[PDB]
Design a protein around this ligand. Structure first.
Ligand SMILES: Cc1cc2nc3c(=O)[nH]c(=O)nc-3n(C[C@H](O)[C@H](O)[C@H](O)COP(=O)(O)OP(=O)(O)OC[C@H]3O[C@@H](n4cnc5c(N)ncnc54)[C@H](O)[C@@H]3O)c2cc1C
Ligand SMILES: Cc1cc2nc3c(=O)[nH]c(=O)nc-3n(C[C@H](O)[C@H](O)[C@H](O)COP(=O)(O)OP(=O)(O)OC[C@H]3O[C@@H](n4cnc5c(N)ncnc54)[C@H](O)[C@@H]3O)c2cc1C
Ligand SMILES: Nc1nc2c(c(=O)[nH]1)N(C=O)[C@@H](CNc1ccc(C(=O)N[C@@H](CCC(=O)O)C(=O)O)cc1)CN2
Ligand SMILES: Nc1nc2c(c(=O)[nH]1)N(C=O)[C@@H](CNc1ccc(C(=O)N[C@@H](CCC(=O)O)C(=O)O)cc1)CN2
Ligand SMILES: [Cl-]
Ligand SMILES: [Cl-]
Ligand SMILES: [Cl-]
Lengths: 291, 291
């Protein structure tokens, strides 16, 4: 089913799960066994992150197919970095021809943690251009989401400019958005309020990634642009050499985050799930949301 | 200044304060000494609650004039209960001719000790009818707000019906709304999300009243329609006969609420302040907003 339809129809919050390209063949098989086990949670949709510069272009199409053949609903991530417009359109075509009904249109990061993005010579610069391409070619026959940033893209000059750019991307033809991970719910609620004042009505699903390793904080702050609230940071610093303690801290924090989001009427939660980590399923189990 | 203009031009949250009709002449002078002291805080606007059934209709106009003469910006509350349309229109005209630029258009509750609202036979039935009068008769000469109910008016059939009627009130000509008091921030955030999905973009300011006595809970739940979160209700139940402890519980609860609302970038906070209670001042001190 199209995500826009799942959202309109829901009997309760939609839970979705995003995984990562596996590192080796054993890991790939283990990921697909995990997806099979994940039916226990009745996921609204599942995805695997797309390699930013197109490194996974063939594998990603085959993964979308394999997800569908397990009876799960794939959200196909697609980026524009490192790829020509023709190359992007070819991958898009292969997803849709495969029966994919749901696309997440993304830019991609610049490589190796560089601050400044440079498009491929015959490529796109902005996710909005890929949203518009999808609509030009497929109209409403697919559902299209994009990324939202409650705390702003790191490269944006202000939250106000970042919101204007989000509105422009919505206007290119998004049906929904999924946020960047965050640890401070107030920043998600603040972004929703800015969106409301700007006349944005589409569903905006919070993205949650429980902290599972202390080493993650550098990526979360430097790449993702997420802030770590005082109390959480202090607990992680105090236990930074104890991986078991860190996991429990991250799960407990995410449980409290998700409980408040649900009480605040979110349409769903999108869980960023490291392939070998049980943390996101632990969060749903602790909230009593395992069917 | 018109509240619509203050909101558009704001550089940080607007803080507003609502007091109550004084009970005797010394209480009246004491209230105006409190308002004089409040000037240093630079509130965006201040108000005194309009008495049930028109009981303060002349005093309220004089009080709005006295607020102006202190250099403060009055918000004039005006209800329709227990008064003819012509009477309401007369008080409205007195406010406008006093130089009041800001009106809060309200229905009013049924009279003390009655549970059913019945309009005056030649009066208005809904706040939206007053909003419409103001727009027809004064247009942009005034800025008009209305009440919003994150947890629904008690007498509404459902939250969906409540929101539809809120939307109709907005459409009649609101520039902003101020919420009913609440104790669970998630219900405020949830209301904003429902409003966003219904295409309501006007500023909606949270109303906060710290719990100062156990006896208040009856009014808060039965008349105001607010829910009391379990942990708060537990603490209060245990300390009913310790007023000092109840004040501390209420103040701390309100501090934590407001800290999160401010982190969520609300356009302002509206404090319901009993004239002789230090609770609001204590909240502002604990937040670092007042010395
Ligand atoms: C839910 C989710 C899933 C993701 N999945 C993947 C994935 O599978 N693969 C991957 O590589 N990455 C993925 N990402 C990461 C994403 O690619 C990066 O965060 C990237 O740096 C920005 O992508 P974007 O689509 O948000 O960019 P865009 O929306 O294109 O924005 C890029 C920058 O340009 C600015 N901008 C936009 N419009 C204008 C304008 N009109 N004028 C000026 N500036 C403008 C924006 O504010 C922003 O600073 C994901 C992110 C999220 C939140
Ligand atoms: C910020 C704030 C300040 C206040 N100040 C005062 C004050 O100074 N003095 C005072 O007496 N009271 C005051 N009140 C209280 C208010 O008068 C009561 O809560 C009252 O019961 C409802 O007033 P309202 O304006 O919200 O009613 P309305 O908006 O008129 O709604 C009344 C009921 O009718 C329903 N409804 C609305 N339109 C329609 C329609 N077209 N058809 C059918 N049903 C409809 C609503 O859903 C609701 O159930 C204040 C409340 C707030 C939140
Ligand atoms: N800017 C941006 N935001 C994004 C993404 C991204 O790539 N870039 N993601 C998707 O595109 C998601 C986040 N992706 C993540 C990928 C890895 C780790 C992580 O914990 N990595 C470990 C190292 C793991 C390893 O080497 O095996 C770490 O940083 O310690 C965290 C988040 C959502 N938002
Ligand atoms: N429905 C409704 N909502 C409303 C109002 C109202 O009158 N009715 N208010 C504005 O119109 C504000 C709340 N007004 C309040 C008025 C008094 C007390 C209170 O504490 N009263 C004491 C009695 C004190 C006494 O007898 O002097 C109590 O209930 O214990 C609380 C809130 C905001 N919302
Ligand atoms: Cl964006
Ligand atoms: Cl006139
Ligand atoms: Cl209403």
């Amino acid at each position: 089913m199209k995500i826009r339809d799942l959202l309109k129809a829901r009997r309760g919050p939609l839970f979705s799960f995003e995984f990562f390209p596996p590192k080796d063949p054993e890991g790939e098989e283990a990921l697909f066994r995990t997806l099979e086990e994940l039916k226990a949670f009745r996921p609204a949709f599942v995805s695997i992150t797309y390699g930013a510069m197109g490194s996974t272009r063939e594998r990603s199409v085959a993964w979308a197919q394999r997800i569908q053949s397990l009876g799960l609903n794939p959200l196909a991530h697609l980026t524009v970095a490192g790829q020509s417009r023709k190359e992007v359109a070819e991958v898009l075509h292969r997803f849709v021809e495969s029966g994919v009904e749901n696309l997440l249109a993304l830019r991609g990061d610049p490589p190796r943690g560089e601050r400044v993005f440079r498009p491929h010579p015959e490529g796109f610069r902005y996710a909005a251009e890929l949203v518009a391409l999808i609509r030009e070619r497929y109209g409403d026959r697919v559902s299209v989401g994009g990324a939202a940033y409650p705390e702003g893209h790191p490269e944006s000059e202000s939250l106000e400019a970042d919101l204007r750019h989000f509105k422009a991307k919505v206007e290119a033809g998004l049906d929904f958005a999924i946020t960047q991970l965050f640890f401070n719910n107030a920043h998600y609620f603040g972004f929703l309020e800015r969106a409301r004042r700007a006349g944005i009505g589409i569903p905006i699903l919070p993205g949650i990634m429980p902290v599972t390793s202390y080493r993650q904080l550098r990526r979360f702050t430097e790449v993702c642009g997420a802030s770590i609230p005082g109390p959480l940071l202090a607990k992680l610093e105090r236990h930074q050499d104890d991986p078991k303690a860190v996991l429990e801290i991250g799960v407990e924090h995410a449980v409290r985050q998700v409980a408040e989001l649900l009480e605040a009427g979110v349409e769903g939660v999108h869980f960023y799930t490291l392939n070998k980590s049980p943390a996101t399923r632990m969060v749903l189990e602790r909230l009593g949301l395992r069917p």
